[PDB]
GROMACS .gro file of C-alpha atoms in nm:
model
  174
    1UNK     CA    1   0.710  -1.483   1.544
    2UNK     CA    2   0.955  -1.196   1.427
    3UNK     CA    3   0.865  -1.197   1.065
    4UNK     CA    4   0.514  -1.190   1.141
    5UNK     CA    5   0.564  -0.924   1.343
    6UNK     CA    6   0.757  -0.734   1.126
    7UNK     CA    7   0.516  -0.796   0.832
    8UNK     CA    8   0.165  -0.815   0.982
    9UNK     CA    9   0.262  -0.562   1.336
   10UNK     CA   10   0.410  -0.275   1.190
   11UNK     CA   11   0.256   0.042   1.317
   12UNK     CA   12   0.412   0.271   1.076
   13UNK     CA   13   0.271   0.039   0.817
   14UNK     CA   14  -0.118   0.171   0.711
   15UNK     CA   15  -0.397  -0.104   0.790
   16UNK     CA   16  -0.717  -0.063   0.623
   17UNK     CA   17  -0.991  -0.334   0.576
   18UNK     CA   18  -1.065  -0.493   0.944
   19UNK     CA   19  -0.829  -0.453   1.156
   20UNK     CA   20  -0.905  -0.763   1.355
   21UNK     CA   21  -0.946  -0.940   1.059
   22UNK     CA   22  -0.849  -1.300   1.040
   23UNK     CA   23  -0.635  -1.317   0.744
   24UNK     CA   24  -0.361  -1.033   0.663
   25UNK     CA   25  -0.259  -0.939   0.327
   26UNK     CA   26   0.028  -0.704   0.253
   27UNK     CA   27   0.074  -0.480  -0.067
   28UNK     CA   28   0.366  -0.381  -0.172
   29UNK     CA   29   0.326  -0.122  -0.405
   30UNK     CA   30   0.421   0.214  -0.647
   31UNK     CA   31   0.182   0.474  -0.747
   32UNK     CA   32   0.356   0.451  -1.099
   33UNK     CA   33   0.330   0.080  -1.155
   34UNK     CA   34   0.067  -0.019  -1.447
   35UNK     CA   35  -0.023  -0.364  -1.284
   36UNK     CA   36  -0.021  -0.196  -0.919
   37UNK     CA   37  -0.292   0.039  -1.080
   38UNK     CA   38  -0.469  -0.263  -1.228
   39UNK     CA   39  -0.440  -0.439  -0.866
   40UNK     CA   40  -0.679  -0.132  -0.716
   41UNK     CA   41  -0.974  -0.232  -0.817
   42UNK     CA   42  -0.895  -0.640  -0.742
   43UNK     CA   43  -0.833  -0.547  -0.412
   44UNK     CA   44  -1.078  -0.357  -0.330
   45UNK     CA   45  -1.307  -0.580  -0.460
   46UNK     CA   46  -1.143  -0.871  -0.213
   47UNK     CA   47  -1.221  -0.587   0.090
   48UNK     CA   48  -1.573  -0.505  -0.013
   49UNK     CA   49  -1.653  -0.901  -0.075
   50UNK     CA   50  -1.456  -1.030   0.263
   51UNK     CA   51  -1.530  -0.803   0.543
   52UNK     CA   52  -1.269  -1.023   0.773
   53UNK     CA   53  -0.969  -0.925   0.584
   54UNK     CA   54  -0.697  -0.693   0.706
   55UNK     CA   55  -0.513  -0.517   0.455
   56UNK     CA   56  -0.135  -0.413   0.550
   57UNK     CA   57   0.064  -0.115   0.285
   58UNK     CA   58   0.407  -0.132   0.199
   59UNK     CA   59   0.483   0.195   0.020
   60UNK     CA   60   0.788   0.072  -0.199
   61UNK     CA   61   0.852   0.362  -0.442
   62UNK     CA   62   1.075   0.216  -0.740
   63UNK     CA   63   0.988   0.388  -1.003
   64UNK     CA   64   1.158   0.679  -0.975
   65UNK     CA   65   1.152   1.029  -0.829
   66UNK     CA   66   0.771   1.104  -0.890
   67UNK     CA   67   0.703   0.751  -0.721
   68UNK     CA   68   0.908   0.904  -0.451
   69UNK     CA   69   0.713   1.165  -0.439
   70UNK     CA   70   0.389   1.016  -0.381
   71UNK     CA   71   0.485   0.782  -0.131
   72UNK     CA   72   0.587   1.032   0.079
   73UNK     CA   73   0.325   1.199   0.041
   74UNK     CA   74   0.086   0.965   0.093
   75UNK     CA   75   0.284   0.831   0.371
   76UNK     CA   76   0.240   1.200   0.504
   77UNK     CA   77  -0.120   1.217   0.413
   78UNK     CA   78  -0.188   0.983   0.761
   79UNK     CA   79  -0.084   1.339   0.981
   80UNK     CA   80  -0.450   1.439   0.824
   81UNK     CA   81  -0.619   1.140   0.851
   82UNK     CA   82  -0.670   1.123   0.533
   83UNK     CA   83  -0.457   0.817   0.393
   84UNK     CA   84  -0.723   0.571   0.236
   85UNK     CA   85  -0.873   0.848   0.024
   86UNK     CA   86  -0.530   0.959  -0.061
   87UNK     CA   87  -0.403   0.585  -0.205
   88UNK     CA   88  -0.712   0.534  -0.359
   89UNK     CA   89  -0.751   0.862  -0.527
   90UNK     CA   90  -0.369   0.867  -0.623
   91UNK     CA   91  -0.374   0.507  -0.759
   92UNK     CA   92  -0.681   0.591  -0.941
   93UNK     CA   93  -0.586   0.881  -1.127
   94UNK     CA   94  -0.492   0.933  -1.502
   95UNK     CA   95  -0.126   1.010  -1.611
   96UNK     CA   96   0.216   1.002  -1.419
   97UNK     CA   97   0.200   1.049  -1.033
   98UNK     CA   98   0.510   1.336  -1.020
   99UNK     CA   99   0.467   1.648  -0.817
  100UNK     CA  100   0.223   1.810  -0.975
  101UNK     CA  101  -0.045   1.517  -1.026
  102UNK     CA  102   0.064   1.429  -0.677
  103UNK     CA  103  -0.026   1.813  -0.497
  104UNK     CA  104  -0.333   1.830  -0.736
  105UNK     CA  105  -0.463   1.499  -0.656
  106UNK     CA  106  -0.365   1.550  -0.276
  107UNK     CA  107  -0.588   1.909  -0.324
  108UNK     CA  108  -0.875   1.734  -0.482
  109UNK     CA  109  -0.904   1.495  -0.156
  110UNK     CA  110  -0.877   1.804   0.080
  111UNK     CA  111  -0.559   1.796   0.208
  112UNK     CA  112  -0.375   2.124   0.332
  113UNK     CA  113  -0.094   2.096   0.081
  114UNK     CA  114   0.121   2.296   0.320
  115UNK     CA  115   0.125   2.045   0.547
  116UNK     CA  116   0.152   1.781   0.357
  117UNK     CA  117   0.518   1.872   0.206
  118UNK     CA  118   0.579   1.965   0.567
  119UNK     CA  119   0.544   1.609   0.669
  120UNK     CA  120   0.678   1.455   0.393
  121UNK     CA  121   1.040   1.540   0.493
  122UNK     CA  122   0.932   1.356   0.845
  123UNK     CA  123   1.178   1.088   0.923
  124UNK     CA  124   0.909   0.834   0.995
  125UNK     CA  125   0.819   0.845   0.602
  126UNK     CA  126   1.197   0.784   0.542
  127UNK     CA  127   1.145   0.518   0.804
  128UNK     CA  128   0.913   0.335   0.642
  129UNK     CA  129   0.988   0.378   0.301
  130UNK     CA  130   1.354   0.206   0.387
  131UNK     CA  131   1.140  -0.097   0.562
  132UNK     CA  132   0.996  -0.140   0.241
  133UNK     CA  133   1.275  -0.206   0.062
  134UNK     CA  134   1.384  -0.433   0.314
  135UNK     CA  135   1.105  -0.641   0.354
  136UNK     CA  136   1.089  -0.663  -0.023
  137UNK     CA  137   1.435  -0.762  -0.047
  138UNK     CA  138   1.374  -1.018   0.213
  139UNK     CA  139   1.064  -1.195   0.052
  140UNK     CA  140   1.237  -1.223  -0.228
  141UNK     CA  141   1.013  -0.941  -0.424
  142UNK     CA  142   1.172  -0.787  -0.740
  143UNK     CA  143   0.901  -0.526  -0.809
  144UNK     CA  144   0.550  -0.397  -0.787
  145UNK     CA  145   0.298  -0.505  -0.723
  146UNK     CA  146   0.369  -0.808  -0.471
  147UNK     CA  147   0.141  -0.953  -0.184
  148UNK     CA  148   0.216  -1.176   0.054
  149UNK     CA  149  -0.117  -1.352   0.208
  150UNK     CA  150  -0.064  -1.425   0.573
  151UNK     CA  151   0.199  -1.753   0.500
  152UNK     CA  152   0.189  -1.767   0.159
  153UNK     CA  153   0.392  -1.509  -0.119
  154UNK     CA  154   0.223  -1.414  -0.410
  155UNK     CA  155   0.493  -1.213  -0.621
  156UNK     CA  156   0.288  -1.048  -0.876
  157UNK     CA  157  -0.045  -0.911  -1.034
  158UNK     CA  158  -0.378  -1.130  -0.923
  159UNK     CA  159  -0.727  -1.100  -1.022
  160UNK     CA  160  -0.956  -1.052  -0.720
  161UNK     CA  161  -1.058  -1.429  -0.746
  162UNK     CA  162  -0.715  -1.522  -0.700
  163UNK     CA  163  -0.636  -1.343  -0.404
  164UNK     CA  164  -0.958  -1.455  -0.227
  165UNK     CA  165  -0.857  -1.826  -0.309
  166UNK     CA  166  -0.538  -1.703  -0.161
  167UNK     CA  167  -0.724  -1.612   0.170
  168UNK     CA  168  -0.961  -1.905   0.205
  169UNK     CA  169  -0.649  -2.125   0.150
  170UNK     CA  170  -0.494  -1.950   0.504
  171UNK     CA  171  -0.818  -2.003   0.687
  172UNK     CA  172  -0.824  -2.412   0.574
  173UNK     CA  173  -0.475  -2.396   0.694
  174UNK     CA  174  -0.489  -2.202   1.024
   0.00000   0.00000   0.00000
């Protein structure tokens, strides 16, 4: 119903894995978070191993003002078509995501950095950013990383066999 659709139907929310997969999983996420970091590589190991998973962001910047930062810009990074590279090359990278790591990062991916600050200040990025939060605070979520996998909440850091027991758990129970 309404929470599904707010969780699983957002538009302004990126979608990467299949999109017609049968099993959603949402990420909510900060580019400064250790254990979000850590989570990269588990969950792109659960896309790469499950090719009928669909994989819903929640950019939910806590961390402060360089967290900011990079969620907006990634968030902006979509006007470019360029958002998966972005996340992953961003979550990826070594030392603090502020400004600077952020534009050089963003650079090193090939976006037009001009842009990109451009449509950061977009009021769709504030948008969803603010959704975040309230989704978060809804779930019950009290920081980064949390997932939720399609009924189920999973409020912290799991391995990549954890969250694909997660997702054959949904499809015994659909």
């Amino acid at each position: 119903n309404a929470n599904r659709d707010s969780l699983f139907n957002d538009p302004n929310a990126p979608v990467l894995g299949n999109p017609e997969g049968d099993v959603t999983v949402v990420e909510f996420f900060d580019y400064n978070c250790p254990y979000c970091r850590r989570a990269m590589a588990e969950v792109q190991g659960l896309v790469d191993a499950d090719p009928n998973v669909r994989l819903v962001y929640r950019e939910w910047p806590i961390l402060g003002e360089g967290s900011d930062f990079a969620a907006r810009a990634a968030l902006a990074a979509r006007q470019q078509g360029k958002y998966e590279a972005f996340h992953w090359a961003l979550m990826g990278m070594s030392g603090k995501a502020n400004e600077t790591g952020v534009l050089r990062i963003a650079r090193e991916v090939g976006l037009d950095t001009e842009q990109l600050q451009r449509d950061m200040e977009a009021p769709e990025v504030t948008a969803h950013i603010a959704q975040s939060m309230a989704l978060a605070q809804k779930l019950g979520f009290n920081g980064t990383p949390s997932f939720v996998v399609e009924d189920a909440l999973v409020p912290g850091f799991v391995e990549q066999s954890q969250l694909q027991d997660a997702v054959d758990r949904a499809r015994k129970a659909a």
